[PDB]
Ligand binder design. Structure first.
Ligand code: ADP
Ligand code: MN
Length: 377
DNA sequence: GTCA
DNA sequence: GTCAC
DNA sequence: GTCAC
DNA sequence: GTCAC
DNA sequence: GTCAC
């Protein structure tokens, strides 16, 4: 065993560096509960999932594969499951399996939690003896495979997650469910998430209508509207603030009232101001429209188009890339969704720019890779 | 993020 | 300093 | 309660 | 956390 | 402490 950075690593005696791997998930793939319940009642509540398993694990072992387990255990980092308790469930599990295994445990959220590919990377980079690992000559077996309800005669309930299949996808590993793999069952029906980060691009206009202009040389108030994670601050900094707009932000000032004051003062200095809040509904936007009317200046709306799933994906990406910032929770997202009212001219706007979400152009490579990965099961 |  | 938000 | 598989 | 008290 | 899930 060893305790690393948001990661656990049990390495067995007899585990040998190899250039192909056969990796599995733990719960639901190698073992299951005797209870028939999701989580283990006793710490004795576990049995091998199929009797075929140790036999196949032995063939693979001799056919040269390195044997590895990729398991999410966040209940650990969240204090719902003491490490040493779990630390030895797998030690136990290993013996009944017989074969030498290498175990990688994702204790927390972030790059290491499947479907994101951290644990895999940690293996090719640090956990072998530098010997490369052929992705296509490898394989991942997992039960979190997004299978539909009633995916087989016996099996009624839909999978709780598509995390294992998506992990495979992000890596490029061939994938199979424990039944397809161990029992030679035929591929089951399944569905992937509706939002696919791989097909997001930079193609198309930065804003609509294209006839309009992003900036104005005269004082105005620009009111952003959009989910947290829609990319408002990033866009506003790159195109408005760096050109002289005063950046007014509740996150920074503490209250809408202070935003209003600060907007008022900026207009008094003859400046152009942008309100970088979520501003989801008519009453939130009216605050700033009123300021514009009072100062006798135009008010425009930048309406950020990111969908909830796009914004959630960005939020996950922020957690992994920018930790000093506090994670927005889904509750915040669902609340925005219920509050939301489309911006319209009747509110008193001079115009409304729609700002579609467009992948960042010259994005650094290694972060493009990360951004491209499915980040939730 | 928000304080409606 | 407490309060509703 | 909001980061158990 | 800030607002209005 | 509130919210939607
Ligand atoms: N156009 C874009 N392409 C790729 N990533 C983006 C884009 N806009 C924002 N991001 C990333 O998404 C996250 C949210 O950005 P941010 O501007 O803070 O959103 P908001 O201000 O709407 O909450 C950040 O990680 C940021 O780097
Ligand atoms: Mn922001």
């Amino acid at each position: 065993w060893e305790s690393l950075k948001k990661l656990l690593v049990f390495t067995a005696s007899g585990v040998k560096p190899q250039g192909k791997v056969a990796a599995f998930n733990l719960d639901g793939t190698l073992i299951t509960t005797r209870s028939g319940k999701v989580f283990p009642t006793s710490p004795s509540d576990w049995r091998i999932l199929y009797p075929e398993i140790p036999k196949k694990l032995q063939e693979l072992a001799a056919e040269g594969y390195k044997l590895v387990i990729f398991t999410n255990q966040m209940g650990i980092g969240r204090g719902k499951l003491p490490a040493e308790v779990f630390k030895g469930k797998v030690e136990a599990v290993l013996e009944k399996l017989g074969v030498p295994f290498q175990v990688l445990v994702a204790t927390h959220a972030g790059l290491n939690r499947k479907p994101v590919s951290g644990m895999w990377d940690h293996l090719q980079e640090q956990a072998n003896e530098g010997i490369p690992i052929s992705v296509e000559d490898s394989v991942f077996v997992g039960d979190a495979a997004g299978r539909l309800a009633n995916w087989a005669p016996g099996r009624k309930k839909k999978d709780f997650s598509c995390a294992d299949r998506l992990f495979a996808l992000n890596v490029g590993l061939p994938f199979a469910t424990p039944e397809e793999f161990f029992l030679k069952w035929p591929a089951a029906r399944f569905e992937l998430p509706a939002f696919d980060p791989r097909t997001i691009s930079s193609a198309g206009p930065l804003y609509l209508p294209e006839s309009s202009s992003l900036l104005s040389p005269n004082p105005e108030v620009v009111v952003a509207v959009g989910f947290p994670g829609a990319g408002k601050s990033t866009f506003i900094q790159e195109h408005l603030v760096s050109a002289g707009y005063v950046h007014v932000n509740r996150d920074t000032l503490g209250s809408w009232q202070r935003c209003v004051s600060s907007c008022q003062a900026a207009l008094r200095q003859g400046k152009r101001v942008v309100i970088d809040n979520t501003n989801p509904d008519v009453p939130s936007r009216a605050r700033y429209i009123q300021c514009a009317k009072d100062a006798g200046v135009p008010c425009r709306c930048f309406n950020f188009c990111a969908t909830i799933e796009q914004a959630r994906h960005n939020n996950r990406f922020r957690e992994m890339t920018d930790p000093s910032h506090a994670p927005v929770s889904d509750m915040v997202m669902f609340s925005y969704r219920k509050q939301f009212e489309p911006p319209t001219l009747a509110e008193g706007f001079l115009e409304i720019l729609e700002i579609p979400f467009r992948l960042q152009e010259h994005l650094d490579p290694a972060l493009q890779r990360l951004y491209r990965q499915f980040s939730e099961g």
